[PDB]
Structures are given as C-alpha cells and as structure tokens.
Amino acid sequence: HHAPSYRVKRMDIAKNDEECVVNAAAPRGLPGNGVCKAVYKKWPESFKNSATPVGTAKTVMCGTYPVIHAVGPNFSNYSESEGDRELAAAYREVAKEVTRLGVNSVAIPLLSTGVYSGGKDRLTQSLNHLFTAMDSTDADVVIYCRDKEWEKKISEAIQMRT
Ligand SMILES: Nc1ncnc2c1ncn2[C@@H]1O[C@H](COP(=O)(O)OP(=O)(O)OC[C@H]2O[C@@H](O)[C@H](O)[C@@H]2O)[C@@H](O)[C@H]1O
C-alpha cells in the first residue's frame, strides 16, 4: 500500500499541509519566540494545559486538529549527555503520539536546534533522533525548517537513505 515518506520544506510550520503538527514547546506551556510563536498564533486553543516535562510530549486538540507539544531540553541547562538523552526521548514520545492519533501525516520541526540549542549547531544530532523515533511509524513526515543551508542538509540526509 502507500509508501511512507519523509520530505523537508523551508517555510513556516504553521502553514503545513499535514494532519497534525509538532510544536517545539516549552515545559511550562508558555508561548515562545521560535516555532512556538507561530504555533501559538495559529492554534492558541492548543495551549490549554499544554505544560509537560522536558523529554515528553503532550497533545492538545485545536478543534479536531492535534498539536503535539514536544519539549526538547534547553542545552544551556542540561549537560551534553543528559540533554542528548532527553532530546531523544522527546522524539520517542512524538512517535507514540503520532501512532496513537492514527494520523496519516505529521509536520515536525527540529527540536532543541534554536532557542534551546545552547548556541551550538545541532541539526545532525536532532535530525538523527527524529529518524530514530519516527522511522518505525508509517505516517508521512514533513520536516519544516527556515534556514536555506539546513534545508539542503536535511534533504541530503533523507535522500541518502533511499
Ligand atoms: N515557524 C517555523 N517553522 C519552521 N521552523 C522554524 C520556525 N521557527 C523557527 N524555526 C526553526 O525551528 C527550529 C527549532 O527552534 P525553536 O522553535 O526555537 O525550538 P527549540 O530550540 O526546541 O526551543 C524551544 C523553546 O523556544 C520557544 O519558541 C519555545 O517556547 C521553547 O521555550 C530552529 O531551527 C528554528 O530556526
């Protein structure tokens, strides 16, 4: 039957064409300045009781549209080793929620690569944890980014596995 795919698009994740969205969220459920800024503007209702611990995900419906609030670690606060573990765990919880929801597709950003990156380039680290979690799901995954060079690198990483 249908072949599950990965794609990357360089555009605002709030404009996605998928059946649900992943917010790069904060543990206290507060609006932020990255992805979460766009998510709060588009789906403010999904922030009712969206607070959840680092390394977890919590889904809140906006109408019937699921917003999966996934909380990556802030690497300014976490050690490299503990932050790596929590980043991986957040994506594992996203994969479980995508499965539970039965969606055919999900729009997802790269967790902990912006406000929570500790000032380091974490594209490969974050993308590889995304793959480790989402590879075993059969939803179409669309990765959203904003940087031109990151779009190219993410696309290369997807393509080199096919
Ligand atoms: N609207 C967007 N669409 C797609 N990608 C985006 C968007 N906005 C930012 N990005 C990119 O998404 C990636 C994740 O960065 P952040 O959204 O800043 O997420 P994170 O690093 O996990 O920090 C989360 C923290 O920031 C606050 O926005 C949020 O409330 C939380 O406190 C970065 O590469 C960023 O450049």
| CA-to-CA separations, 72 to 18, 69, 98, 102, 129, in angstroms, rounded | 22, 10, 17, 23, 11
User: Residue 15, Cβ neighbours under 10 Å: how many?
Assistant: 11
**46 ligand 1 Cβ < 6 A:** no
Q: Is 33 in the pocket of ligand 1 (CB under 6 A)?
A: yes
Distance CA 136, CA 124 (A): 19
Q: What's the Cα-to-Cα distance from 3 to each of 7, 52, 104, 138, rounded to whole Å?
A: 13, 33, 11, 8
Full 3-state SS string of 89-153: HHHHHHHHHHHHHCCCEEEECCCCCCCCCCCCCCHHHHHHHHHHHHCCCCCEEEEEECCHHHHHH
Query: For residue 68, how many other CB atoms are within 10 A of its CB?
Result: 25
**3-state class (DSSP) for residue 157:** helix
Q: Is 102 left (phi over 0), alpha (psi -120 to 50) or beta?
A: left
Cβ(67)–Cβ(45) below 8 Å: no
Contact partners, residue 139, CB within 8 Å, separation at least 6:
4, 98, 99, 103, 104, 105, 106
Measured by CA distance, the residue closest to atom 10 of ligand 1 is 35
**Structure determination method:** X-ray
Q: Is 12 in the pocket of ligand 1 (CB under 6 A)?
A: yes
What is the Cβ-side half-sphere exposure of residue 69, based on CA atoms within 13 angstroms? Answer: 30
- Ligand 1 atom closest to residue 23's alpha carbon, by position in its atom list: 17
Q: Domains in the chain and their CATH numbers?
A: 6-159 (3.40.220.10)
Residue 18: CB atoms within 10 A of its CB come to: 20
CB 140 within 8 A of CB 4: yes
